[PDB]
Design a protein around this ligand. Structure first.
Ligand SMILES: CC(C)(COP(=O)(O)OP(=O)(O)OC[C@H]1O[C@@H](n2cnc3c(N)ncnc32)[C@H](O)[C@@H]1OP(=O)(O)O)[C@@H](O)C(=O)NCCC(=O)NCCS
Ligand SMILES: CC(C)(COP(=O)(O)OP(=O)(O)OC[C@H]1O[C@@H](n2cnc3c(N)ncnc32)[C@H](O)[C@@H]1OP(=O)(O)O)[C@@H](O)C(=O)NCCC(=O)NCCS
Lengths: 392, 393
């Protein structure tokens, strides 16, 4: 009574800007929409229906208000999907929605379920970072705490210094992300993975205009240039990172439909990819967001591969210096790294990205008819997730 | 690849404190950290195993706000001074969380993702109360579209009661037995093994520390109880049958369960102690809301290929007396085998913790009585129920 988990479908909403094109939706409606999206997608070509899903696991970071009370379950019920399907919500910060695919893969593996949905939601426009704690952030740690665990903006500086990354270095990476995202969109790469989402049109204020617009484009793309990026002011006094070279605050959701390979084939669905190796490792608190070194390491070790074997990497662009520190250590081919742009241009709904990255990856492997992809992400509390997926 | 054979190797819990009770002095992260260290230490007595050997931790926690925000499982671990390379995630399927957590570690072992994991659960209700995780306007945490008749939990316990013709006497009786059975277990010593005494700040008559750091080892919810006493109590809702005497207690506690691939366990010289026969987290009927233990109990029995008769020991969480009774009315088990060591009505119910607690309590009872199969099942907010059938090895 065990199983062989495979990705059967994956899809994502477009990613909206803060107070942008999806900010009209209640966070539970966004996630619901996407949850319904994957099931519907899989229903085109098969018998599969929402009731056939057994468990849903959703990543979400700031689990407060609209994102309190186990948003994965509420989203599901709110989309009018079947009440018998279980659902759990998870937090390993920015790893959450990646970690969620690992967990569904595990339950399938253990024979607990045959059909699962991993997903991730973040509606930063509506629940901002910090919403989940009082204003006195000193209080969310015990008085004993003495770990030099810096904030994330300081972490990107500490990492940069460690590797000798410079303001020009990042501004260049920054620019390429915008360049490559703009290229993907021009060529139509994201068309398949994206599920247009209807959304309340809001006015110049943040009130609804009665209109219900269909959104299908990532809103963070922006004509960008080395000059423009050079003009931008650092986030921290003396730091190298700016809005131009950090991720964007965003609204979005993604979902990935998993099954035991045999059940999939039985419903007449095509097994599309499988996890070769997965990991959620702890990182070094001091540098905090440099974990992608460690997670990339583990899954390569577990997979019995070397970075050379990977065709496509998705390493989340929380901060330029995170991706560059990783590249400096693991020396990959940067033509294979964030080939369709990263979060610096596409934005970074925290709980969602992990499932978004897997989604993006799978599709690119399929577009280019390649095989192995690595996904890896730094995360608050000094943790990093890692996956190597493989096309089937 | 390379997959695995998940088995429980160790399990432990703090005593469960009352609201503003014996553990209310501890920051929620300290409580969880203490127990996280407890299991590993326990396993270290008889083997080489050390905290660094754990690969992933997954902790259940419901009101993930403030002290319980920012992925408590991780912070708790770091705060206990345990190794920083060990990954950790925190989960919410309400009261199911800490049970769902054992499922997920069991899956990751199964999938070959890790060889050593810790499932655990924390809730420090004294310090982060239900609701903390949302603004006062609780209308706002649902979209404006929402029209599901998903009642609050106190109303759910009434709706369920009516469905099954459960009466105030019915519940008051069950309520009383829970206190009787918890009080028996403690008298005989049943919980001694599973419990890990926790050092805690002594607080005054106010809620300020007295400088004293006392060692706590007993569940604080036990209370001389009687049918008269329970009859005296006022209902929580006007016209309801449930009272504080027959609902769960608001509590502080944590529990942790060390898993491994059976082979790795044996290699470290640790004894595989139990394994999951079947697991489930099912959706329930929104209208009745907390009657999901019918469904979850059903699924795992189905999956396990067993009937309720096969189960030696049941742990069905006593959120509300009517929840257990409704279940029993449907599944007709032997109530001598149901919550044999008392339930949350007497022992309290730290929401994010209970799930891991129940598995812990069950495993130990199977061991004490030298029996084999146990069922754990819980109702949970959002109309969900977890369910596990574990088996001694
Ligand atoms: C850094 C951060 C705060 C952004 O700050 P922000 O000022 O609110 O970002 P904005 O988009 O409002 O402003 C950034 C600027 O980039 C500028 N920009 C980018 N490319 C440009 C170009 N080619 N020419 C001119 N300007 C350009 C914009 O003009 C914009 O300023 P404006 O308001 O004058 O238009 C945000 O990206 C962030 O917090 N990221 C990470 C958060 C985090 O901790 N994440 C982890 C989650 S646990
Ligand atoms: C119902 C609930 C609110 C308890 O209410 P409470 O009044 O705060 O409980 P207290 O312990 O303060 O009071 C209950 C009474 O039981 C009484 N009691 C019990 N046995 C008794 C006996 N034999 N003789 C006399 N009194 C007895 C106590 O005297 C006590 O009242 P007191 O303050 O006069 O001593 C709480 O149990 C609860 O909220 N439970 C469920 C919460 C929930 O939703 N959980 C799900 C999490 S998602």
């Amino acid at each position: 009574s065990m199983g062989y988990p495979v990705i059967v479908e994956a899809t994502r909403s477009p990613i909206g800007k803060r107070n942008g094109w999806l900010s009209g939706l209640h966070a539970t409606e966004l996630l619901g929409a996407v949850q319904k999206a994957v099931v519907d997608k899989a229903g085109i070509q098969s018998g599969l229906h929402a009731g056939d899903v057994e468990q849903v696991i959703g990543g979400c970071v700031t689990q407060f208000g609209e994102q309190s009370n186990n948003i994965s379950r509420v989203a599901w019920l709110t989309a009018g999907l079947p009440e018998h399907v279980g659902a759990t919500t998870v937090d390993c910060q920015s790893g959450s929605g990646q970690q969620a695919n690992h967990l569904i893969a595990g339950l399938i593996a253990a024979g607990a379920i045959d059909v699962g949905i991993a997903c991730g939601i973040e509606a930063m426009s509506r629940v901002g970072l910090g919403a989940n704690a009082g204003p006195d952030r000193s209080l969310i740690r015990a008085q004993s705490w003495d770990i030099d665990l810096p904030n994330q903006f300081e972490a990107a500086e500490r990492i940069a210094k460690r590797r000798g990354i410079t303001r020009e270095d990042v501004d260049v990476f920054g620019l390429e992300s915008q360049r490559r995202a703009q290229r993907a969109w021009a060529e139509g790469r994201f068309d398949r993975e994206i599920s247009p989402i209807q959304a309340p049109v809001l006015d110049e204020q943040n009130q609804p205009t009665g209109e219900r617009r269909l959104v299908f484009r990532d809103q963070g793309l922006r004509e960008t240039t080395m000059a423009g990026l050079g003009e931008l002011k650092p986030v921290l006094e003396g730091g190298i990172h700016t809005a131009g070279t950090s991720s964007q605050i965003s609204d979005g959701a993604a979902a990935v439909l998993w099954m035991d390979e045999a059940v999939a084939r039985a419903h007449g669905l095509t097994p599309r990819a499988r996890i070769v190796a997965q990991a959620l490792v702890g990182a070094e608190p001091y540098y905090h967001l440099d974990g992608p070194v460690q997670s990339t390491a583990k899954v390569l070790e577990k997979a019995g591969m070397k970075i050379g074997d990977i065709d496509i990497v998705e390493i989340n662009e929380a901060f330029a210096s995170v991706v560059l520190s990783w590249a400096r250590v693991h020396e990959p081919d940067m033509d294979r790294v964030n080939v369709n742009g990263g979060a610096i241009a596409l934005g970074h709904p925290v709980g969602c990205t992990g499932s978004r990255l897997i989604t993006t990856a799978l599709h690119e492997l399929e577009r280019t008819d390649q095989s192995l992809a690595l996904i890896t992400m730094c995360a608050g509390g000094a943790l990093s997730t890692g996956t190597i997926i493989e096309r089937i």
